[PDB]
Write a protein that binds this ligand. Structure first.
Ligand SMILES: CN(C)c1ccc2cc(C(=O)NS(=O)(=O)c3ccccc3-c3ccccc3)oc2c1
Ligand SMILES: CN(C)c1ccc2cc(C(=O)NS(=O)(=O)c3ccccc3-c3ccccc3)oc2c1
Ligand SMILES: [Zn+2]
Ligand SMILES: [Zn+2]
Lengths: 258, 265
């Protein structure tokens, strides 16, 4: 599938997804932006939209501040929607673990809300119980919302869940290109802001000891110990004050028990 | 709890509901008309309303015609909202089965829609799988909307679901006073209207129950009350004709349109 219609956006795909044969051989796919069902023609989509009664993901809203929500979706309850989500995601992922056996997985769907509904920005999948302590399986932001802070938001959100349940976590390897950039950029900003104010640091922040030690090495703040480079710490705090991140996870706005 | 603020209505309660102790001993409760959360003060409600972004039940709209919708809410998905709904309902119910273990239940919320949102009129709960074939557990209409046709609408709607999935159904017993009146009045009008459109063509009970979705038991008791039962249906024509005459002039102001239901069983 070369391109998809997803609501009011026409979006050019990055990769191929295993949509069933009779859909896979089509040049364009037509998608409901709310239930994520896939269809063959624009007249079929226009007729689904008239009779479909969803304006949000089919799940419990665990976060809402400003016009930004997170819905906590269970693969064992809303199986078909989560399967549809996995096929949508692969169009913008180099690879992903599974598409169908979604029942042992949770799906945190990020939306941006207006009068017309809760429109899908992106998501991250998570194993209900992961032996390797992975707090993220796959993570994805749709093209139209990229380079605007939603990526950092979701990564920060994934670490808040880990903190709340009192276990340091890590994304499942290997990561996507934009994934690797985001995660490294996140770890940098968090560690620098957290120092202005290792085993102790990992506890406060919820980042795996491995992930922290590699980030310090990249910043040249590692003796063979943490070397405080102040010019780096001060100038980062200056960069945040004179523009600010407009999209920011407020811990007080999370309604969730682990 | 004597009285509740529910949107733009102050409403006097009929019964007590098991709201937790620290709320139960209060003279008034303040309720969000959209998410159904309960609060202690007017200033607390005014501050919830600013940051709550809901103007309808948090679920799939399966019906909308004129300014009337039905939302299909699942106890296993929107657990807390359905729990809040159960506590709201008990304030106007003599009794109800459960309040908390809502996960095996579906909740059909009826709304009347204007520019300010989808405002709650009433609901009926239903077991996802009932061994006794109950198509309604509890049903309730809020006072301000009573005696206006919303009650008959929801009962009619509950039987359309039963028809669609191809099983005759019945409300869980025992029924409330207004429940018993509505249901008996509904069964009468439906059986009489359903007979006018058979010209003469003699119909059986098992065939009638299939067309209408009403339990054979419920039908046989209604015929007995109307004196239209041999030991089979005795068509009293003057009764059938005069009912159709009553509908022709008045018209039923709120009416379930089967073409407007977007739902698979
Ligand atoms: C398609 N796909 C698999 C994926 C996978 C992952 C991502 C991430 C993003 C993203 O847009 N990230 S980001 O919000 O731009 C950001 C990430 C880290 C650090 C900073 C910022 C930032 C902050 C403010 C302004 C601009 C940038 O898109 C993605 C897409
Ligand atoms: C509180 N609770 C458990 C309940 C439970 C059940 C009900 C039912 C009703 C209702 O209002 N039903 S009604 O059909 O609207 C109606 C009731 C009486 C007298 C007349 C009419 C009527 C009929 C047709 C056109 C206009 C008016 O309120 C209810 C409240
Ligand atoms: Zn849809
Ligand atoms: Zn609310």
């Amino acid at each position: 599938p070369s391109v998809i219609e997803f609501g009011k956006y026409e979006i050019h795909t990055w990769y191929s997804s295993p949509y069933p044969q009779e859909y896979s051989r089509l040049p364009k796919l037509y998608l409901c932006e709310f239930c994520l069902k896939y269809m063959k023609s624009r007249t079929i989509l226009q007729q689904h939209m008239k009779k479909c009664g969803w304006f949000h993901p089919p799940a419990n809203e665990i976060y809402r501040k400003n016009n930004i929500s997170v819905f906590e979706v269970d693969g064992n309850v809303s199986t078909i929607y989560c399967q549809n989500l996995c096929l949508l995601a692969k169009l913008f992922l180099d690879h992903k673990t599974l598409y169908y056996d979604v029942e042992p997985f949770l799906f945190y769907v990020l939306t941006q809300n207006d009068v017309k509904g809760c429109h899908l920005v992106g998501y991250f999948s998570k194993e209900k119980h992961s032996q390797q302590k992975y707090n993220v399986s796959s993570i994805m932001i749709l093209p139209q919302y990229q380079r605007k802070g939603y990526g950092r938001f979701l990564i920060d959100f994934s670490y808040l869940l880990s903190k709340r349940e009192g276990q340091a976590g890590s994304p499942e390897k290997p990561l996507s290109d934009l994934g690797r950039l985001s995660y490294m950029a996140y770890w940098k900003s968090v560690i620098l802001e957290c120092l202005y104010h290792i085993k102790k640091l990992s506890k406060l922040t919820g980042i795996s000891p491995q992930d922290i030690t590699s980030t310090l090495h990249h910043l040249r703040m590692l003796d063979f110990v943490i070397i405080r480079r102040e010019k780096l710490i001060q100038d980062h705090m200056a960069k945040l004050q004179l523009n600010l991140r407009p999209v920011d996870v407020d811990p007080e706005s999370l309604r969730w028990t682990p």
